[model samples]
Target: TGEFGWVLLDEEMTVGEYTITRKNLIFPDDKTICYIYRFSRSVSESAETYVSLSKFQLGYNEMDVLRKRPNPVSQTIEGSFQGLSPGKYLLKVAYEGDVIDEVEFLVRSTRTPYIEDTSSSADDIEK
Candidate 1:
Protein backbone atom coordinates (compact mmCIF):
# COMPACT_ATOMS: atom_id res chain seq x y z
CA THR A 1 0.00 0.00 0.00
CA GLY A 2 1.14 3.54 -0.81
CA GLU A 3 -0.46 4.78 2.42
CA PHE A 4 -3.58 5.86 0.63
CA GLY A 5 -7.30 5.84 1.44
CA TRP A 6 -9.56 4.20 -1.11
CA VAL A 7 -12.43 1.78 -1.65
CA LEU A 8 -13.14 -0.66 -4.44
CA LEU A 9 -15.50 -3.33 -5.74
CA ASP A 10 -13.86 -6.51 -4.49
CA GLU A 11 -16.53 -8.85 -5.80
CA GLU A 12 -18.56 -9.69 -8.93
CA MET A 13 -21.74 -11.65 -9.51
CA THR A 14 -24.60 -12.48 -11.90
CA VAL A 15 -28.13 -11.14 -11.86
CA GLY A 16 -31.14 -12.83 -13.44
CA GLU A 17 -29.03 -14.84 -15.91
CA TYR A 18 -27.24 -11.64 -16.87
CA THR A 19 -23.96 -10.19 -15.64
CA ILE A 20 -24.51 -6.82 -13.99
CA THR A 21 -21.23 -5.83 -12.41
CA ARG A 22 -21.86 -3.75 -9.29
CA LYS A 23 -20.44 -3.21 -5.84
CA ASN A 24 -21.21 -1.79 -2.43
CA LEU A 25 -20.49 1.90 -1.79
CA ILE A 26 -18.04 3.47 0.66
CA PHE A 27 -17.26 7.17 0.82
CA PRO A 28 -13.71 8.07 1.70
CA ASP A 29 -14.07 11.29 3.69
CA ASP A 30 -16.61 14.07 4.25
CA LYS A 31 -14.54 16.79 2.59
CA THR A 32 -14.64 14.93 -0.70
CA ILE A 33 -17.86 13.03 -0.18
CA CYS A 34 -18.90 10.92 -3.17
CA TYR A 35 -20.80 7.86 -4.44
CA ILE A 36 -19.52 5.98 -7.48
CA TYR A 37 -21.10 2.90 -9.04
CA ARG A 38 -21.89 1.17 -12.36
CA PHE A 39 -24.55 -1.39 -13.22
CA SER A 40 -26.09 -3.09 -16.27
CA ARG A 41 -29.55 -4.47 -16.90
CA SER A 42 -31.39 -6.45 -19.58
CA VAL A 43 -33.21 -3.30 -20.75
CA SER A 44 -30.05 -1.86 -22.33
CA GLU A 45 -30.76 -3.58 -25.66
CA SER A 46 -33.70 -1.24 -26.45
CA ALA A 47 -35.21 1.14 -23.93
CA GLU A 48 -33.41 4.22 -22.73
CA THR A 49 -31.67 3.53 -19.40
CA TYR A 50 -32.31 5.98 -16.57
CA VAL A 51 -31.37 6.02 -12.91
CA SER A 52 -31.24 8.63 -10.13
CA LEU A 53 -31.25 9.09 -6.43
CA SER A 54 -34.71 8.67 -5.01
CA LYS A 55 -34.06 10.05 -1.51
CA PHE A 56 -31.39 10.94 1.09
CA GLN A 57 -32.08 11.27 4.78
CA LEU A 58 -29.98 12.24 7.79
CA GLY A 59 -30.59 11.66 11.50
CA TYR A 60 -33.23 13.19 13.78
CA ASN A 61 -35.96 14.06 11.23
CA GLU A 62 -33.50 15.91 9.00
CA MET A 63 -33.60 14.97 5.35
CA ASP A 64 -32.86 16.27 1.87
CA VAL A 65 -33.47 15.40 -1.77
CA LEU A 66 -30.23 14.42 -3.50
CA ARG A 67 -31.10 13.84 -7.15
CA LYS A 68 -28.12 12.23 -8.93
CA ARG A 69 -29.56 12.04 -12.44
CA PRO A 70 -32.69 13.04 -14.27
CA ASN A 71 -32.06 10.72 -17.22
CA PRO A 72 -29.54 8.02 -18.09
CA VAL A 73 -28.86 6.18 -21.36
CA SER A 74 -28.13 2.48 -21.94
CA GLN A 75 -28.63 -0.42 -19.56
CA THR A 76 -25.25 0.21 -17.96
CA ILE A 77 -25.39 3.31 -15.74
CA GLU A 78 -22.38 4.87 -14.06
CA GLY A 79 -21.67 8.14 -12.27
CA SER A 80 -20.43 9.78 -9.10
CA PHE A 81 -22.19 12.04 -6.56
CA GLN A 82 -19.77 14.40 -4.87
CA GLY A 83 -20.01 16.61 -1.77
CA LEU A 84 -22.48 14.77 0.44
CA SER A 85 -23.11 15.09 4.16
CA PRO A 86 -21.58 12.62 6.61
CA GLY A 87 -24.01 10.49 8.55
CA LYS A 88 -26.35 7.56 8.37
CA TYR A 89 -28.31 7.96 5.14
CA LEU A 90 -31.13 6.22 3.31
CA LEU A 91 -30.63 6.02 -0.43
CA LYS A 92 -32.57 4.67 -3.38
CA VAL A 93 -31.87 3.95 -7.06
CA ALA A 94 -34.52 4.72 -9.62
CA TYR A 95 -34.87 3.33 -13.11
CA GLU A 96 -36.85 5.54 -15.44
CA GLY A 97 -40.19 6.24 -13.72
CA ASP A 98 -39.86 3.41 -11.29
CA VAL A 99 -37.62 3.07 -8.20
CA ILE A 100 -35.78 -0.14 -9.05
CA ASP A 101 -33.93 -0.59 -5.78
CA GLU A 102 -32.64 1.16 -2.67
CA VAL A 103 -30.31 0.61 0.28
CA GLU A 104 -29.03 2.26 3.44
CA PHE A 105 -25.47 3.56 3.46
CA LEU A 106 -23.17 5.73 5.55
CA VAL A 107 -21.02 8.71 4.62
CA ARG A 108 -18.35 8.37 7.29
CA SER A 109 -16.40 11.38 8.47
CA THR A 110 -12.70 11.62 9.28
CA ARG A 111 -13.32 13.63 12.40
CA THR A 112 -12.67 11.98 15.74
CA PRO A 113 -14.72 12.20 18.92
CA TYR A 114 -13.92 14.37 21.92
CA ILE A 115 -13.78 13.13 25.51
CA GLU A 116 -14.69 15.39 28.41
CA ASP A 117 -12.65 15.34 31.62
CA THR A 118 -14.97 13.98 34.28
CA SER A 119 -12.37 14.20 37.08
CA SER A 120 -11.77 17.93 36.63
CA SER A 121 -8.32 19.51 36.16
CA ALA A 122 -5.12 17.75 37.19
CA ASP A 123 -4.27 20.54 39.71
CA ASP A 124 -7.11 19.30 41.90
CA ILE A 125 -5.51 15.87 42.29
CA GLU A 126 -4.70 16.71 45.94
CA LYS A 127 -8.41 16.70 46.79
Candidate 2:
Protein backbone atom coordinates (compact mmCIF):
# COMPACT_ATOMS: atom_id res chain seq x y z
CA THR A 1 0.00 0.00 0.00
CA GLY A 2 1.97 2.93 -1.30
CA GLU A 3 -1.07 5.18 -1.61
CA PHE A 4 -0.96 8.48 0.23
CA GLY A 5 -2.74 11.78 0.00
CA TRP A 6 -5.89 13.66 0.97
CA VAL A 7 -9.38 12.22 1.19
CA LEU A 8 -12.88 13.36 1.94
CA LEU A 9 -15.80 11.94 3.93
CA ASP A 10 -18.40 9.66 2.49
CA GLU A 11 -22.13 10.04 2.82
CA GLU A 12 -22.03 7.56 5.66
CA MET A 13 -19.29 9.57 7.38
CA THR A 14 -16.47 7.21 6.47
CA VAL A 15 -13.34 7.99 4.57
CA GLY A 16 -13.75 7.71 0.81
CA GLU A 17 -10.93 6.74 -1.47
CA TYR A 18 -12.77 8.35 -4.39
CA THR A 19 -11.72 11.69 -2.96
CA ILE A 20 -8.15 10.65 -2.35
CA THR A 21 -5.58 12.57 -4.36
CA ARG A 22 -2.26 14.30 -3.92
CA LYS A 23 -3.22 17.92 -3.76
CA ASN A 24 -0.35 20.35 -3.70
CA LEU A 25 -2.63 23.34 -3.36
CA ILE A 26 -5.50 23.65 -0.91
CA PHE A 27 -7.91 26.46 -0.38
CA PRO A 28 -10.14 27.72 2.41
CA ASP A 29 -13.40 26.42 1.04
CA ASP A 30 -16.07 23.89 1.81
CA LYS A 31 -14.37 21.15 -0.18
CA THR A 32 -10.97 21.80 1.37
CA ILE A 33 -12.48 22.00 4.84
CA CYS A 34 -13.29 18.29 4.90
CA TYR A 35 -10.11 17.03 3.24
CA ILE A 36 -8.08 14.74 5.51
CA TYR A 37 -4.35 14.08 5.27
CA ARG A 38 -3.51 10.41 4.93
CA PHE A 39 -0.65 8.03 4.20
CA SER A 40 -0.56 4.30 3.61
CA ARG A 41 2.06 1.59 3.73
CA SER A 42 2.03 -2.18 3.59
CA VAL A 43 2.65 -3.81 6.92
CA SER A 44 1.84 -7.04 8.69
CA GLU A 45 -1.84 -7.50 9.35
CA SER A 46 -2.98 -5.88 12.58
CA ALA A 47 0.58 -5.24 13.59
CA GLU A 48 1.53 -2.41 15.88
CA THR A 49 3.95 -0.11 14.05
CA TYR A 50 4.91 3.45 14.78
CA VAL A 51 4.34 6.27 12.29
CA SER A 52 4.42 9.98 12.90
CA LEU A 53 3.60 13.15 11.03
CA SER A 54 5.82 16.12 11.64
CA LYS A 55 4.21 19.29 10.37
CA PHE A 56 6.22 22.35 9.47
CA GLN A 57 5.70 25.84 8.23
CA LEU A 58 7.87 26.59 5.20
CA GLY A 59 8.91 30.16 4.80
CA TYR A 60 10.87 31.86 2.06
CA ASN A 61 14.27 30.82 3.35
CA GLU A 62 13.64 28.77 6.45
CA MET A 63 11.21 26.31 7.98
CA ASP A 64 9.67 26.19 11.42
CA VAL A 65 8.09 23.26 13.17
CA LEU A 66 4.38 23.67 13.64
CA ARG A 67 3.04 20.54 15.30
CA LYS A 68 3.73 16.83 15.36
CA ARG A 69 1.59 13.74 16.00
CA PRO A 70 2.39 10.07 16.34
CA ASN A 71 -0.15 7.80 14.78
CA PRO A 72 -1.33 4.77 16.69
CA VAL A 73 -0.39 2.15 14.08
CA SER A 74 0.52 1.55 10.49
CA GLN A 75 -1.09 -0.02 7.44
CA THR A 76 -2.95 3.13 6.77
CA ILE A 77 -2.79 6.28 8.85
CA GLU A 78 -5.07 9.29 8.71
CA GLY A 79 -5.17 12.71 10.28
CA SER A 80 -6.76 16.12 9.83
CA PHE A 81 -6.28 19.68 10.90
CA GLN A 82 -8.56 22.60 11.54
CA GLY A 83 -8.19 26.37 11.41
CA LEU A 84 -5.35 26.37 8.90
CA SER A 85 -4.03 29.55 7.38
CA PRO A 86 -2.49 30.52 4.05
CA GLY A 87 1.09 29.31 3.80
CA LYS A 88 3.32 26.53 2.60
CA TYR A 89 3.19 23.39 4.72
CA LEU A 90 5.53 20.43 4.99
CA LEU A 91 4.70 16.97 6.22
CA LYS A 92 7.41 14.53 7.20
CA VAL A 93 6.37 10.94 7.62
CA ALA A 94 8.53 8.99 9.98
CA TYR A 95 8.37 5.31 10.75
CA GLU A 96 9.98 4.19 14.02
CA GLY A 97 12.11 7.35 14.19
CA ASP A 98 13.42 6.90 10.63
CA VAL A 99 12.21 9.40 8.09
CA ILE A 100 10.72 7.49 5.21
CA ASP A 101 8.69 9.92 3.16
CA GLU A 102 7.63 13.52 2.95
CA VAL A 103 5.22 15.81 1.14
CA GLU A 104 4.47 19.49 0.69
CA PHE A 105 1.29 21.46 0.17
CA LEU A 106 0.19 25.02 -0.02
CA VAL A 107 -2.78 26.54 1.78
CA ARG A 108 -4.07 29.33 -0.40
CA SER A 109 -6.75 31.91 -0.12
CA THR A 110 -10.13 30.81 -1.34
CA ARG A 111 -10.87 31.08 -5.01
CA THR A 112 -13.06 34.10 -5.50
CA PRO A 113 -15.05 34.96 -8.56
CA TYR A 114 -12.48 35.90 -11.12
CA ILE A 115 -14.75 38.32 -12.90
CA GLU A 116 -16.91 40.65 -10.86
CA ASP A 117 -19.47 43.37 -11.71
CA THR A 118 -21.14 41.46 -14.45
CA SER A 119 -24.38 43.13 -13.56
CA SER A 120 -25.62 46.04 -11.45
CA SER A 121 -27.32 43.70 -8.99
CA ALA A 122 -24.15 41.73 -8.31
CA ASP A 123 -21.77 42.59 -5.54
CA ASP A 124 -18.15 41.53 -5.35
CA ILE A 125 -16.76 40.26 -2.11
CA GLU A 126 -13.05 40.35 -1.39
CA LYS A 127 -11.50 37.49 0.44
Candidate 3:
Protein backbone atom coordinates (compact mmCIF):
# COMPACT_ATOMS: atom_id res chain seq x y z
CA THR A 1 0.00 0.00 0.00
CA GLY A 2 1.42 3.40 -1.04
CA GLU A 3 1.04 6.38 1.22
CA PHE A 4 0.10 10.00 0.47
CA GLY A 5 2.75 12.51 -0.64
CA TRP A 6 3.21 16.24 -0.18
CA VAL A 7 4.90 18.95 -2.23
CA LEU A 8 6.91 21.15 0.10
CA LEU A 9 8.08 24.72 -0.46
CA ASP A 10 11.77 23.96 -0.24
CA GLU A 11 12.94 27.51 -1.11
CA GLU A 12 11.86 31.02 -0.29
CA MET A 13 11.08 33.33 -3.18
CA THR A 14 13.40 36.27 -3.92
CA VAL A 15 10.49 38.68 -3.66
CA GLY A 16 8.63 39.30 -0.39
CA GLU A 17 8.25 35.91 1.32
CA TYR A 18 5.11 34.07 0.21
CA THR A 19 3.75 30.67 1.28
CA ILE A 20 2.83 28.21 -1.49
CA THR A 21 -0.64 26.66 -1.24
CA ARG A 22 -2.19 23.51 -2.74
CA LYS A 23 -5.64 21.93 -2.64
CA ASN A 24 -7.52 19.13 -4.46
CA LEU A 25 -4.41 17.53 -5.94
CA ILE A 26 -5.34 15.24 -8.85
CA PHE A 27 -3.26 12.11 -9.05
CA PRO A 28 -2.79 10.73 -12.56
CA ASP A 29 -4.22 7.59 -11.05
CA ASP A 30 -7.39 6.99 -9.04
CA LYS A 31 -6.97 7.63 -5.32
CA THR A 32 -8.24 9.34 -2.16
CA ILE A 33 -5.91 11.81 -0.44
CA CYS A 34 -5.43 14.56 2.15
CA TYR A 35 -2.68 17.01 3.13
CA ILE A 36 -1.03 18.92 6.01
CA TYR A 37 0.99 22.10 5.66
CA ARG A 38 3.46 24.23 7.71
CA PHE A 39 4.79 27.72 7.11
CA SER A 40 7.11 30.47 8.41
CA ARG A 41 8.01 34.01 7.34
CA SER A 42 11.78 33.51 7.36
CA VAL A 43 14.73 33.00 9.71
CA SER A 44 15.13 36.79 9.98
CA GLU A 45 11.45 37.11 10.87
CA SER A 46 9.66 35.65 13.90
CA ALA A 47 10.33 31.96 14.58
CA GLU A 48 6.92 31.51 16.23
CA THR A 49 4.73 31.47 13.05
CA TYR A 50 3.08 28.81 10.83
CA VAL A 51 -0.03 27.20 9.10
CA SER A 52 -1.33 23.80 7.95
CA LEU A 53 -3.70 22.23 5.35
CA SER A 54 -6.06 25.06 6.04
CA LYS A 55 -7.40 25.51 2.51
CA PHE A 56 -9.01 23.69 -0.40
CA GLN A 57 -9.31 24.03 -4.20
CA LEU A 58 -12.59 25.32 -5.52
CA GLY A 59 -14.68 26.05 -8.69
CA TYR A 60 -13.15 25.31 -12.11
CA ASN A 61 -9.76 26.45 -10.84
CA GLU A 62 -7.06 23.80 -11.27
CA MET A 63 -5.76 24.54 -7.74
CA ASP A 64 -7.06 25.33 -4.25
CA VAL A 65 -7.11 28.31 -1.94
CA LEU A 66 -5.09 28.36 1.33
CA ARG A 67 -6.38 30.42 4.23
CA LYS A 68 -3.91 31.70 6.78
CA ARG A 69 -4.30 30.06 10.15
CA PRO A 70 -3.80 32.74 12.79
CA ASN A 71 -2.51 34.74 9.83
CA PRO A 72 0.57 32.67 8.93
CA VAL A 73 3.75 34.59 8.15
CA SER A 74 5.17 31.84 5.90
CA GLN A 75 4.09 28.31 4.99
CA THR A 76 4.67 24.80 3.50
CA ILE A 77 2.41 21.81 2.62
CA GLU A 78 2.63 18.09 3.50
CA GLY A 79 0.25 15.14 3.09
CA SER A 80 -0.49 11.67 1.68
CA PHE A 81 -2.36 9.74 -1.08
CA GLN A 82 -3.77 6.24 -1.67
CA GLY A 83 -4.82 4.08 -4.73
CA LEU A 84 -2.53 6.02 -7.09
CA SER A 85 -1.54 4.18 -10.26
CA PRO A 86 1.75 4.28 -12.19
CA GLY A 87 2.28 7.36 -14.34
CA LYS A 88 3.62 10.92 -14.46
CA TYR A 89 1.77 13.57 -12.47
CA LEU A 90 2.26 17.26 -11.75
CA LEU A 91 2.48 18.73 -8.24
CA LYS A 92 1.69 22.42 -8.18
CA VAL A 93 2.22 24.81 -5.30
CA ALA A 94 0.74 28.28 -5.06
CA TYR A 95 1.62 31.48 -3.21
CA GLU A 96 -0.14 34.78 -2.60
CA GLY A 97 -3.31 32.92 -3.61
CA ASP A 98 -1.87 32.06 -7.02
CA VAL A 99 0.16 29.44 -8.82
CA ILE A 100 3.83 29.84 -7.89
CA ASP A 101 5.64 26.51 -8.26
CA GLU A 102 5.13 23.04 -9.71
CA VAL A 103 6.81 19.61 -9.75
CA GLU A 104 6.36 16.22 -11.45
CA PHE A 105 6.76 12.61 -10.29
CA LEU A 106 6.10 9.04 -11.40
CA VAL A 107 4.01 6.56 -9.39
CA ARG A 108 4.45 2.96 -10.37
CA SER A 109 2.92 -0.25 -9.06
CA THR A 110 3.69 -0.91 -5.39
CA ARG A 111 4.47 -4.53 -6.02
CA THR A 112 7.81 -3.52 -7.60
CA PRO A 113 10.12 -3.79 -4.63
CA TYR A 114 13.50 -2.05 -4.35
CA ILE A 115 16.56 -4.00 -3.21
CA GLU A 116 19.29 -1.65 -1.97
CA ASP A 117 21.86 -4.43 -1.46
CA THR A 118 23.05 -6.19 -4.60
CA SER A 119 26.34 -7.44 -6.09
CA SER A 120 27.17 -3.79 -6.85
CA SER A 121 26.88 -2.82 -3.19
CA ALA A 122 29.50 -5.43 -2.11
CA ASP A 123 31.83 -4.49 -4.97
CA ASP A 124 31.80 -0.84 -3.96
CA ILE A 125 32.48 -1.70 -0.32
CA GLU A 126 35.55 -3.84 -1.30
CA LYS A 127 36.98 -0.97 -3.32
Candidate 4:
Protein backbone atom coordinates (compact mmCIF):
# COMPACT_ATOMS: atom_id res chain seq x y z
CA THR A 1 0.00 0.00 0.00
CA GLY A 2 1.04 3.59 -0.55
CA GLU A 3 2.01 5.68 2.46
CA PHE A 4 0.74 9.21 2.84
CA GLY A 5 1.74 12.43 4.62
CA TRP A 6 1.36 16.20 4.58
CA VAL A 7 3.73 19.19 4.33
CA LEU A 8 2.78 22.55 5.72
CA LEU A 9 4.73 25.61 4.63
CA ASP A 10 5.07 28.94 6.30
CA GLU A 11 2.30 31.31 5.30
CA GLU A 12 4.51 34.35 5.51
CA MET A 13 6.43 33.61 2.33
CA THR A 14 5.93 35.86 -0.63
CA VAL A 15 4.62 34.60 -3.93
CA GLY A 16 8.09 34.72 -5.44
CA GLU A 17 9.56 32.32 -2.90
CA TYR A 18 9.19 28.56 -3.04
CA THR A 19 9.77 26.00 -0.33
CA ILE A 20 10.44 22.30 -0.56
CA THR A 21 11.05 19.73 2.12
CA ARG A 22 11.29 15.99 2.74
CA LYS A 23 8.89 15.84 5.61
CA ASN A 24 7.21 12.67 4.34
CA LEU A 25 9.13 11.27 1.47
CA ILE A 26 8.97 7.77 0.00
CA PHE A 27 12.34 6.20 -0.47
CA PRO A 28 12.82 4.99 -4.02
CA ASP A 29 13.98 1.50 -3.07
CA ASP A 30 11.29 0.70 -0.54
CA LYS A 31 8.17 -1.43 -0.82
CA THR A 32 6.10 1.72 -1.03
CA ILE A 33 5.69 1.03 -4.81
CA CYS A 34 4.48 4.57 -5.47
CA TYR A 35 5.23 8.19 -4.67
CA ILE A 36 2.78 10.97 -4.06
CA TYR A 37 4.20 14.48 -4.25
CA ARG A 38 1.84 16.91 -2.59
CA PHE A 39 2.12 20.59 -1.75
CA SER A 40 -0.07 23.37 -0.47
CA ARG A 41 0.23 27.09 -0.03
CA SER A 42 -1.81 29.85 1.55
CA VAL A 43 -1.31 32.92 -0.53
CA SER A 44 -3.41 35.74 -1.87
CA GLU A 45 -1.35 36.22 -5.01
CA SER A 46 -1.91 34.23 -8.17
CA ALA A 47 1.00 31.99 -8.93
CA GLU A 48 2.02 28.88 -10.81
CA THR A 49 3.54 26.00 -8.90
CA TYR A 50 5.37 22.85 -9.95
CA VAL A 51 7.15 19.85 -8.51
CA SER A 52 9.96 17.90 -10.15
CA LEU A 53 12.29 14.96 -9.54
CA SER A 54 15.89 15.17 -10.62
CA LYS A 55 18.87 12.87 -10.66
CA PHE A 56 21.02 12.68 -7.57
CA GLN A 57 24.06 14.19 -9.26
CA LEU A 58 22.02 17.17 -10.50
CA GLY A 59 22.59 16.07 -14.06
CA TYR A 60 19.15 15.81 -15.60
CA ASN A 61 15.53 16.44 -14.85
CA GLU A 62 13.85 13.06 -14.59
CA MET A 63 10.19 13.96 -14.33
CA ASP A 64 7.99 17.05 -14.34
CA VAL A 65 4.58 15.56 -13.50
CA LEU A 66 1.99 18.25 -12.82
CA ARG A 67 -0.39 17.88 -9.95
CA LYS A 68 -4.11 18.56 -9.78
CA ARG A 69 -5.73 20.47 -6.97
CA PRO A 70 -9.09 21.96 -6.25
CA ASN A 71 -7.39 25.13 -5.01
CA PRO A 72 -4.08 26.58 -5.97
CA VAL A 73 -2.82 26.07 -2.48
CA SER A 74 -2.95 22.28 -2.35
CA GLN A 75 -2.05 19.49 -4.74
CA THR A 76 -1.29 15.75 -4.75
CA ILE A 77 0.45 13.85 -7.49
CA GLU A 78 0.94 10.08 -7.52
CA GLY A 79 3.23 7.98 -9.70
CA SER A 80 4.61 4.45 -9.79
CA PHE A 81 8.33 4.00 -10.44
CA GLN A 82 10.01 0.72 -9.82
CA GLY A 83 13.57 -0.60 -10.01
CA LEU A 84 15.25 2.63 -9.01
CA SER A 85 18.88 2.33 -8.04
CA PRO A 86 19.76 3.25 -4.49
CA GLY A 87 21.25 6.72 -4.28
CA LYS A 88 20.60 10.29 -3.30
CA TYR A 89 17.66 12.05 -4.89
CA LEU A 90 16.26 15.56 -4.89
CA LEU A 91 12.81 17.01 -4.84
CA LYS A 92 12.21 20.55 -6.01
CA VAL A 93 9.27 22.86 -5.64
CA ALA A 94 8.98 25.94 -7.78
CA TYR A 95 6.85 28.99 -7.33
CA GLU A 96 6.17 31.51 -10.09
CA GLY A 97 8.67 29.94 -12.47
CA ASP A 98 11.56 30.10 -10.01
CA VAL A 99 12.87 27.21 -8.03
CA ILE A 100 12.46 28.32 -4.46
CA ASP A 101 12.82 25.13 -2.47
CA GLU A 102 14.74 21.87 -2.66
CA VAL A 103 14.98 18.80 -0.47
CA GLU A 104 17.45 15.94 -0.71
CA PHE A 105 16.67 12.37 0.33
CA LEU A 106 18.39 9.04 0.25
CA VAL A 107 16.77 6.12 -1.52
CA ARG A 108 18.19 3.19 0.32
CA SER A 109 17.75 -0.38 -0.77
CA THR A 110 16.16 -2.86 1.56
CA ARG A 111 18.80 -4.64 3.57
CA THR A 112 18.63 -8.31 2.67
CA PRO A 113 21.04 -11.00 1.75
CA TYR A 114 20.86 -12.96 -1.44
CA ILE A 115 21.29 -16.61 -0.63
CA GLU A 116 21.92 -19.41 -3.03
CA ASP A 117 21.82 -23.11 -2.12
CA THR A 118 22.07 -25.67 -4.85
CA SER A 119 20.43 -28.47 -2.85
CA SER A 120 17.94 -26.50 -0.79
CA SER A 121 14.23 -26.64 -1.27
CA ALA A 122 12.06 -23.52 -1.57
CA ASP A 123 10.44 -24.28 1.82
CA ASP A 124 13.87 -24.17 3.54
CA ILE A 125 14.65 -20.69 2.21
CA GLU A 126 15.05 -17.91 4.72
CA LYS A 127 14.81 -14.26 3.86
Top candidate on lDDT is 4
How far in Å is the alpha carbon of 83 misplaced in model 4?
Answer: 4.5
lDDT of 2 by residue, 43-92 (tens): 44334333333334344332333233434343455555454565556555
- Worst ten in a row by lDDT for model 4: 1-10
Off by over 4 Å in 3: 1-74, 111-127
Residue ranges of candidate 2 with Cα displaced over 4 Å: 8-18, 29-41, 44-74, 111-127
lDDT of each: 0.38, 0.45, 0.36, 0.46
Per-prediction tally of clashes: 0, 0, 9, 0
TM-score for all predictions?
0.42, 0.50, 0.34, 0.45
lDDT per residue for candidate 3 within 46-100, as digits (tens), equals 2322222221224112333333332234343444445544444554444445443
TM-score for candidate 2, residues paired by index: 0.50
Query: Which is better, 1 or 2, measured by lDDT?
Result: 2
Model 1: colliding residue pairs:
none
| Per-model C-alpha RMSD | 12.2, 8.1, 14.5, 12.6
Q: Quote the lDDT for 95 in model 1.
A: 50
lDDT of 4 at 50: 62
Candidate 1 Cα outliers beyond 4 Å, as residue runs: 1-26, 30-40, 45-50, 54-74, 113-127
